[PDB]
Ligand binder design. Structure first.
Ligand SMILES: CC(C)(O)[C@H]1CC[C@](C)([C@H]2[C@H](O)C[C@@]3(C)[C@@H]4C[C@H](O[C@@H]5O[C@H](CO)[C@@H](O)[C@H](O)[C@H]5O)[C@H]5C(C)(C)[C@@H](O[C@@H]6OC[C@@H](O)[C@H](O)[C@H]6O)CC[C@@]56C[C@@]46CC[C@]23C)O1
Length: 431
């Protein structure tokens, strides 16, 4: 019979004071969840496991020297007028390293064949459910390494006020390099964060103030490079007037997934639908931020369409609308939205009351993040998984696929819609 237990929990400080001021993008995450993603590895041959665990521990400490925020803590000051400030103290209080053993549990137990994410996956991460503002006391980075019969799982819990998805995977890429023998990471973070004026920080903000919540389930779908290329051509072929074939591969796929989810739920064609993209500000500010700007730097772009138009209007029209919402996130709108936020600095509510699954769909992560380059010395990973802690939001999480140019999507929806999707030949997934 299989089981799961914790062997040890250890504080990891940076191998070798300063403060970081947080900007609007960072503060918005204070009352939300951590990023919880991890990497699954197969051990074809025998491995000296105590030596592997020790090597991950020491290479983690070496990497933290280059990313001191992950070894620090948040500092929150609450004021009588119900406002607050927040910053990161790089005080080297340390990350947390959790060593767990899943007896009689295997790779294939974790990757159930073309099925749903099994419950064991959520236990491969530590500090599940902890909101980011609890980083005043809790580590900003927790690493759980779980031993399996035929491999290991490396699961990270990262405070979303400190880092977005891009920065999460910058750190993982850099940790893998250090573990492989690199002296320094190949990409060094930019740690000073963005404000329109030096006088803005510390920003003084206020805290506080869903269909089938708690009942959602999670399933992965795989999209080959070919099927993606097929959808891009189709979408661009349907919008000829004014096109140099500028609908991207990702836009076409996301448009296709949106249509497929709505098709499978079978809803009134008068329903209004909201599709939440996160648009990176790094490349869009003038002057742009550094590519390796370490923090949050992205804004919701909300695509809105009637269900009837979404389906009856064709793939290219949906993808064209997405392309246009992305294009409106200009340097002007980023800066004006920032300025407008400073004058009503309220952390957001997570939005409307939803009465069906397709109503509000959140798109997270990106296929541009490097998942399969994370060789720590024992080979590339077999798969990427998240904690699947979320059972509240209808959500699509994007991952680079194992094959060149493919994409894995992790879909969190009611079970019956995920079943319809897996039986829909128009949904052009594979495996
Ligand atoms: C266009 C309309 C008609 O007005 C309206 C109708 C209403 C709505 C559908 C819009 C609101 O209008 C604003 C809206 C987007 C909310 C406020 C947030 O958006 C931020 O709102 C603040 C202001 O409060 C802006 O300044 C930021 O630019 C913006 O980003 C976001 C995030 C950032 C927390 C978001 O989380 C990221 O999901 C992507 C992942 O990749 C990341 O991991 C992850 O963090 C989850 C969704 C969520 C909660 C909601 C939900 C949907 C809302 C409620 O559109």
């Amino acid at each position: 019979m299989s089981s799961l237990r914790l062997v040890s929990s250890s504080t990891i400080q940076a191998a070798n004071s300063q403060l970081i001021d947080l900007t609007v993008w960072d503060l918005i995450g204070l009352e939300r969840e951590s990023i919880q993603q991890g990497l699954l590895y197969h051990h074809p041959n025998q491995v000296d496991t105590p030596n592997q665990i020790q090597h991950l521990k020491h290479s983690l400490s070496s990497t933290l020297s280059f990313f001191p925020p992950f070894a620090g803590r948040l500092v929150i000051t609450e004021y009588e007028d119900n406002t607050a400030t927040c910053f990161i103290a790089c005080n080297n209080a340390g990350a947390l390293f959790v060593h767990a053993v899943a007896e009689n549990t295997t790779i294939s137990d974790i990757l159930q064949p073309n099925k749903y994410v099994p419950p064991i996956v959520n236990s491969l991460f530590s500090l599940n459910g902890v909101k980011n503002r609890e980083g005043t006391i809790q580590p900003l980075l927790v690493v759980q390494v779980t031993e399996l019969v035929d491999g290991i799982f490396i699961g990270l819990t990262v405070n979303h006020v400190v880092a977005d998805g891009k920065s999460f995977w910058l750190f993982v890429n850099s940790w893998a390099e250090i573990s492989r023998g690199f002296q320094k990471p190949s990409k060094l973070p930019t740690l000073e964060r963005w404000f329109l004026n030096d006088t803005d920080h510390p920003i003084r903000f206020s805290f506080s103030m869903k269909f089938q919540s708690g009942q959602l389930t999670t399933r992965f779908f795989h999209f080959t490079r070919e099927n993606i290329a097929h959808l891009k051509s189709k979408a661009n072929g349907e919008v000829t007037g004014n096109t140099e074939r500028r609908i991207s591969s990702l836009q076409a796929l996301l448009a296709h997934v949106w249509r497929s989810v709505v098709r499978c739920e079978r809803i009134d064609p008068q329903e209004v639908l909201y599709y939440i993209l996160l648009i990176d500000a790094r490349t869009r500010l003038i002057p742009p931020l550094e590519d390796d700007y370490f923090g949050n730097a992205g804004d919701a772009g909300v695509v809105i369409m009637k269900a009837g138009e979404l389906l009856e209007g064709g793939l290219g029209n949906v993808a064209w609308n997405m392309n246009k919402v992305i294009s409106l996130n200009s340097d002007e709108k980023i800066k004006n939205r920032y300025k407008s936020w400073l004058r009503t600095p309220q952390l957001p509510s997570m939005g409307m009351h939803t009465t069906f699954a397709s109503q509000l769909l959140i798109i997270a992560n990106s296929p541009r993040f490097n998942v399969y380059g994370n060789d720590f010395g024992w080979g590339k990973p077999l798969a990427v998984r998240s904690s699947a802690e979320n059972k509240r939001d209808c959500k699509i999480v994007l991952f680079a696929g194992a094959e060149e140019g493919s994409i894995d999507i992790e879909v969190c929806l009611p079970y019956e819609i995920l079943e319809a999707l897996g039986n829909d030949a128009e949904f052009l997934d594979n495996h």
